[PDB]
Write a protein that binds this ligand. Structure first.
Ligand SMILES: O=P(O)(O)OC[C@H]1O[C@](O)(COP(=O)(O)O)[C@@H](O)[C@@H]1O
Ligand SMILES: O=P(O)(O)OC[C@H]1O[C@](O)(COP(=O)(O)O)[C@@H](O)[C@@H]1O
Ligand SMILES: O=P(O)(O)OC[C@H]1O[C@](O)(COP(=O)(O)O)[C@@H](O)[C@@H]1O
Ligand SMILES: [K+]
Ligand SMILES: [K+]
Lengths: 518, 518, 519
C-alpha cells in the first residue's frame, strides 16, 4: 500500500502511529512550501536555477544585513533564474520573494573604545547598566552602556537582561533614573555592540525602525510578495507595518514574526491583524526558555490552522547541513514534526544563505515534507477542522469543504481550482486535504503568494482570455490537467476534483465536479 | 494554571495544541528516563556524581570500544558515584547499568596494504567487490575486498551497497560466482576497514558475534541490569541473546536495537520476544532513507506503548551539544516530540560520552522531557490505551487501570505502588498516568530496572521487614510519602493513590486507596 | 457471546446497533428499578408477595383517590408481603413505599345541576368561562364555571384552555374581570367536574393543595420512603414540599413530577432543588403536544444522568396490558428505549393498580429492562459521563470512578459497596457500570431508597455490629458475596469489586479491592 493509506484508516491515533510504514512510498506531490534564505551560497543565477529544481518556493531576503543594491541584485538573480523556466508554462514553477525586516534592536556600546576587545563577566559580580552616552565607547566589566533610552521604564527589580544572543544573563537589583545595578547570573566574554533581550518585558521600541521604514518602501518598489515583520508584540505593530506599506503595498502579505513573550501572549490579536505567522524559533528561544519553544510552536501552528492563516516554522531545522551533506536524526525529526503539527511552510536560513550544501538542504526538506504529509492523521484532523469551523451562508466555503470531503471519498489525485485572488484555493487548503491543490490563475502575484498555503501548487496561465467564457474556463481546467500529468501527480483515467464558479469575477466559486483525468 | 491543565481539558487535539501555554509551569517530577553513554567526558567519579544530580537514570556502556578492564572500571565508577548518595534513603536515586553490544559487522579490507591510505571513488565508475582473500590487503579504486562470505547470496543486480557511514553508495550491475560488479553512485574517499551496510538485505551474519558472547558473559559477572542487543533482525536473534545470558542472566532485561530494514519489517516478532526496544536511529538512518526514520520511530514507539513494553529513543537528540553549551531548535523539538510520541526513555551518546558539555546535555533532556510530559493529550491517550488493552481476568490489571482512572479524577500528586518484581508498577505505567509512580521495592535490581518505564520513580526501601505484615506495608507506604514530600512531588494534604496487595509475595496487588498526604 | 458483549466492543454507535444480537442472552441481574402503582388488582398480601417475586421494587400509592384508611391498609399489606421474606436475609429484597400526591387541580362545575348530565360543544361555538359562583352548578353549552379564581390573570387572548384530560379545547377570544369568552376548537361531550389544563400558562395555584397537606402528614406518620410531588412548576414549589415535610420528614426523598410547560422550562432549578424527577408523561402529554413528549423525556433523563439524580419514566409504558396478557410492539419498544435513554426507574400505573394482568406487566418490564441494559453502549456512555464530570478533590468520587473503570476491565460480577446513607453506592451508580451494585447497609431506609438508582441492588444486613471494626466490615462484604451467589449474579472464583472506607461513619469510602468470589 502507498501514501501511508493503511495508517490513514486506523480508528485511533495510537493505531495510526503503529501502522506508519517505511515501505509505503509517498505520492509525487509535496504540499509544504519551502522558504530559502538567499545569501553568498545561493545567490548566483546558476545556483538559483538548481534551488528551484530542488524545491525552493520562496526566496527570503534577510534585511538584517546587506545594502539595497545588494538585495536588488539578489532579487534580479532570483527572477532571472525563475523566468528561465517560463518558456514552458506546463513546467514553470512560480517563486515568491519575501523581505524579512531587521526590526528594532537593543545594542550595547564599545568595550574599551575597541570593536574587537572583550571583557570577562564573572557569575555573581556587579555590573551597572548606564544610558549616559559619555560611556557609549567605555564599556567594561563594571559599566555597560546600551542604546535603549527607555529600558528603565520597562524592567523592575528582579527582571532579567540577556546580552549577546542570551550568552550572558543579568538580574536587576536596583533601578535608578538612567541606570540599573545588576548581578551577573551567567557570565562569559562580553564584546562590543551585542544584542540585548528583555525576557518578559513589554518593550516599547517602535513597531518599525527608521531602517525598516526605508526597507519596506524598497520592498514595495521591488514588487516583493510578502514581508516577514520582526519582533511583532501586539496588533498595533502589524497595523504600523500595514500603514508603511500603504495603498501601493496593500496586496503584500504581512507575516508577523513571533519572537518574544509579549508576542506569544498577545498572539490572538496579532494573528487577527496579520496575513500569517512565522514561528521565529531563533530569537524566540533566546527570549523564552529553550525547553518551552515547542509549546509556543505547536500553540501557534494550531491557532493558525484554526484560523485558516499560513504559518511558517523557521530556524535551525537542518542546521548541521551548513557544514555537512546529510542532516542529524533530530533535524530529520524536526522537519517531519513541523509538517505533522500543521506548518504551511518550513524554512532554511544559514543552510541555504551561507552553508556548504544549500541544494542538499532544500532536497532534504522536500524529501521529509513529502513523507510527513502522508503520515498526517487526516481522519481526525479533517473531523476537527470541520467541527471547529463556523456554519456560514458563504457558498464558496460550502463548495470548498464539499470538494475536500469528495477528495477523501474518491482518493483523488488533485483538487483543481480556478482562482483570481487565490482565495478559493486558500479555502480548500484550510481543510487540509491529502490531494494536492492545483490553483490555476492568470494573476502572477496570486501564483507567488499561494506558496504560503499547505497543499497549493500554483500554476500561472499565460493564454489570452478566450472570447467564450465557458471555453476560457475549460482551457484553464485543461491546463491544470496537463500540469498534473507532466509533474506525475496523476495520469489519464485517475479521478480529480475540479472547482469553478458560475460567472467571471472573484467570489463566485460554487461548482464542484468529479471527473476522470483525460 | 499549571501543568498545561487548560490544554488537558480540550475536547479536540487541535484545541489541545491551541491551548499549549508557555506560562503554564510543569510539575517537579520528570517521568521520562534519561540514558547516558559513558566515555572519557563522563567516566570520572566526580562527573558521574553530577550526571546523577543532573538526571541520569541509566549508564550505558558501549562495548563497540574498550576492553573488559576499561568497562569494569566504568561500572565500578558508576557504582561508587551512585552509592555515594546511599546514606539518605529518602534521597538516594537508583542508577541502572546497561551493556550495549558491538554486534555483527561487515568490514572492507586494507587500501594499499596500509591502514591510513585512501583512494578516490568517482561517481559513475566501476568498482568490483571480491571475496577473494588475495585482495584482502590490496583494496583500491578498482577492487574492493570485504569479509562477508555470503554477500552474493543476499544481494541482486539493482541492489545497493553502502560503505563507511553510508558515505559511499554502490549499485550492483552484475553478479558473478565470487564477485559483484558495481557502479559508484555516491563517490568519496574510501579508506581501510570501513563499515558496510546492505539496505533491504536479509543479512545472515550470526545473531551474536564471538566477542558478543564474551561480553554478555562479562555483563552477567558484572551484574548489569539490561543488555541493548545490536542489529536485531528477527525473533531468533533475541532468543540467541537470551540463551547466552542463560539461567544466571535470566532477570537481565533484553532491549532489542532496531537498526535495519529487516528489524523494522520483523518488528512484531522481535517485540514479542524482547523486554523492550531501542529505536537505534543512527544505524537505522544509514540503512533506510533518513527522511523515513521518523516513520520507523513513531511506528515502534506506538507499538511498544500498545504492548506495554519499554521503548528508548536514541542518537543525535542533542548532537550539537557535543561542541556547544545549548542545543539547536531542531534538537529541542526532537526531544519534546520523542516524549510526546510515547518514548519511555531518551538517550545521549557522544553528547555524554565524549562531548564538552555532558552535564548540560543531561540537564536539557530533563528540562524538555518534563515540559513535554505536561503537553501530552492524556484525555485521548488514556481512552485509546484503555480501548486497545484486553478485558482480562487478571485482578492486578483491573487494579492498575482503576488506580490510573482515580489518579486523573482527583489530580493526585502520585501513584504509590509496593512491588517486589516491578510488575505492578509496570502495569500502572502502561496506562500513562500524569501523576508520577513511586514504586517502593526492597529489591535493588527491581529499583534499577524500573527506570525503563515512563513515570516510574523507583525508591529502594532499606528498613528490615517488620514482624507484622500490615505494619511492614504501612512502613513502605510512609517511605513513599516521605520521598514524594522531599522531592517536591506533593505536599501535606494533597491526595495520592496507593496500590498494595492482600498478602505478601508477588502477584497479589489488588487494593487501591485514595489517601491524603500526611 | 452473552450480554451483547460483541456490540459492546463496536467502535461506533452505528456498528453497535448493527451488532445487537437476539441470540446473545443477558445476565441475571436487572438494574432498572420497577415502580408499581398498587390498587384493587394488586393490594392483597398474596398478590403483593407475587409482585415482589416478579420484580416490583417500589410500591406507589396514588393519593388522587382512596381514604387514609384504605392507603394505610395497602401500606400494611406491602410490609406484610415484604417482611414475609425477611427470615432469610440472603434472599430478602427491600421494597420502598412512595406517596404520589393528588396535587393542585382546576375543575369545572356541574352541568345542569346534575353530576351525570352532559352537553355537546360544537367546534367554532362560543363558550363563556365564568368565575361567578352563582353558575357553579349551572354549567351548560353557553356558560362554564371553574374553580380557579385567578385564571384571568394567567391567560391572554389567544391562550388555549383544555378541558377533561384535553378532550375539549377552547381558545380565549376576550378577557373580562371575572370571565373569558372562548371559541371551541375541539368539541365533544362536556360533563361535570372535569379537569382543566392551561398549556403554556405560569399557573399560580399553591405548590401543595389542602388535601396534599393532610396526605403529606399521613406519609410522615406512615414512614414512607419518598414523595412524588405533583405539578411541580418551579424550585420554590419543591422548597414548599420540603418545608411541609419539615424536620420529621427530612429524610423522605422528594421526586418532582414534571407535567407542564412551566416545569419543563424551569427544569434546571427544579432538579437542583429535588432528590429526583418523574417524567410524568400522562399529564405532560395533555399539556404539551403529544409529538413533543419524547423530547422532554430525553432532555430530562439526560440532565438527570448529568446531575447524578434519579429519574423515573412513567405512564402508559405497557398500557394495553390493563386488558391483555401481552404488550404491543410500541410498548415493548417504549420500555427498552426508556432504559436506553438512561431512566433509573420505570413505572406501571393502571397496569398494576387495576388491570387484569398485574403480575404479567411487572414480569414484562423486568424482561425488557434486562435486555435493554445489556444493549446500552457503555463504551460511549462511560466516556461521556467521565468527561462531563468534574476533577474533584473528593476522594470518595475518585474511588467510585476507579471502581467502575476496574469493573469494566475485568467484567466483574458485581461492585459491592458498604454504605450507611447510600451515597457511596449512588456515586458508583452515576457512572453507569454494567455490573450490578450490591449496596450493603444496616440502614433500612437507605436500603429502600437505593432502589431509585440504576444498578443498585440494596441488601439489608441484620447481623449485630462486631466488636472489631475490621471483622464487622469483612462480615458485610461476605454477606454481599453470599447474596450475589444466591441470586445467580456470580459464582465462586469470579472477580468482584469491593468498596469500603478507612474508618467507620459516612464519608470515608476510599478503598477499592478486586477480589475473587470465595468458596
Ligand atoms: O478565488 P477567487 O479570487 O474568488 O476567484 C475564483 C473565480 O474564478 C472563476 O472560476 C473564473 O473567473 P475568471 O474567468 O474571471 O478568472 C470564477 O467563476 C470564480 O468566481
Ligand atoms: O510484603 P511483600 O512481599 O513486599 O508484598 C507487598 C505487596 O507487593 C506486591 O508484591 C506486588 O509485587 P509484584 O509487583 O512483584 O507483584 C503484592 O502482591 C503484595 O501484597
Ligand atoms: O462501619 P460503618 O460505620 O457502617 O462504615 C463502613 C464504611 O461505610 C462508609 O460509611 C460509607 O458510608 P456512606 O456511603 O454513607 O459515606 C464508609 O465511610 C465506611 O468506612
Ligand atoms: K531579519
Ligand atoms: K529573528
Amino acid at each position: 500500500q502507498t501514501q501511508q493509506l493503511h495508517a490513514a484508516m486506523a480508528d485511533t491515533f495510537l493505531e495510526h502511529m503503529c501502522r506508519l510504514d517505511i515501505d509505503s512510498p509517498p505520492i509525487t506531490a509535496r504540499n509544504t512550501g519551502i522558504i530559502c534564505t538567499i545569501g553568498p551560497a545561493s545567490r548566483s543565477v546558476e545556483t538559483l536555477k538548481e534551488m528551484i529544481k530542488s524545491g525552493m518556493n520562496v526566496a527570503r531576503l534577510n534585511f538584517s544585513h546587506g545594502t539595497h543594491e545588494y538585495h536588488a541584485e539578489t532579487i534580479k538573480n532570483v527572477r532571472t533564474a525563475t523566468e528561465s523556466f517560463a518558456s514552458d508554462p506546463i513546467l514553470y514553477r512560480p517563486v515568491a520573494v519575501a523581505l524579512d525586516t531587521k526590526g528594532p534592536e537593543i545594542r550595547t556600546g564599545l568595550i574599551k573604545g575597541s570593536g574587537t576587545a572583550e571583557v570577562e563577566l564573572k557569575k555573581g559580580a556587579t555590573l551597572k547598566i548606564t544610558l549616559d552616552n559619555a560611556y557609549m565607547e567605555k564599556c567594561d566589566e563594571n559599566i555597560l552602556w546600551l542604546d535603549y533610552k527607555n529600558i528603565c521604564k520597562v524592567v523592575e527589580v528582579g527582571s532579567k537582561i540577556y546580552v549577546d544572543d542570551g550568552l550572558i544573563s543579568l538580574q536587576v537589583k536596583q533601578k535608578g533614573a538612567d541606570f540599573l545595578v545588576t548581578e551577573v547570573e551567567n557570565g562569559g566574554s562580553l564584546g562590543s555592540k551585542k544584542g540585548v533581550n528583555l525576557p518578559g518585558a513589554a518593550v516599547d521600541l517602535p513597531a518599525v525602525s527608521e531602517k525598516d521604514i526605508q526597507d519596506l518602501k524598497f520592498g514595495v518598489e521591488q514588487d516583493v510578495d510578502m514581508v516577514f515583520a520582526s519582533f511583532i508584540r501586539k496588533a498595533s505593530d502589524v497595523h504600523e507595518v500595514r500603514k508603511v506599506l500603504g495603498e501601493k503595498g496593500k496586496n503584500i502579505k504581512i507575516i508577523s514574526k513571533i519572537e518574544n513573550h509579549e508576542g506569544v501572549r498577545r498572539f490572538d490579536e496579532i494573528l487577527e491583524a496579520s496575513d500569517g505567522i512565522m514561528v521565529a524559533r531563533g530569537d524566540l528561544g533566546i527570549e523564552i526558555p529553550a525547553e518551552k519553544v515547542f509549546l509556543a510552536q505547536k500553540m501557534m501552528i494550531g491557532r493558525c490552522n484554526r484560523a485558516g492563516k499560513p504559518v511558517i516554522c523557521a530556524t535551525q531545522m537542518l542546521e548541521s547541513m551548513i557544514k555537512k551533506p546529510r542532516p542529524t536524526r533530530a533535524e530529520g525529526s524536526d522537519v517531519a514534526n513541523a509538517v505533522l503539527d500543521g506548518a504551511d511552510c518550513i524554512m532554511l536560513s544559514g543552510e541555504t544563505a551561507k552553508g556548504d550544501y544549500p541544494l542538499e538542504a532544500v532536497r532534504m526538506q522536500h524529501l521529509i515534507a513529502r513523507e510527513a504529509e502522508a503520515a498526517i492523521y487526516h481522519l481526525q484532523l479533517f473531523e476537527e477542522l470541520r467541527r471547529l469551523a463556523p456554519i456560514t451562508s458563504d457558498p464558496t466555503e460550502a463548495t470548498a469543504v464539499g470538494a475536500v470531503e469528495a477528495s477523501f471519498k474518491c482518493c483523488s489525485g488533485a483538487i483543481i481550482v480556478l482562482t483570481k485572488s487565490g482565495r478559493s484555493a486558500h479555502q480548500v487548503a484550510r481543510y487540509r486535504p491529502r490531494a494536492p491543490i492545483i490553483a490555476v490563475t492568470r494573476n502572477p502575484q496570486t501564483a507567488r503568494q499561494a506558496h504560503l498555503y499547505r497543499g497549493i501548487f500554483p500554476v500561472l496561465c499565460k493564454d489570452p482570455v478566450q472570447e467564450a467564457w465557458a471555453e476560457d474556463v475549460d482551457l484553464r481546467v485543461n491546463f491544470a490537467m496537463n500540469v498534473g500529468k507532466a509533474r506525475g501527480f496523476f495520469k489519464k483515467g485517475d479521478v480529480v476534483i475540479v472547482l469553478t464558479g458560475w460567472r467571471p469575477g472573484s467570489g463566485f466559486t460554487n461548482t464542484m465536479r468529479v471527473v476522470p483525468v483525460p
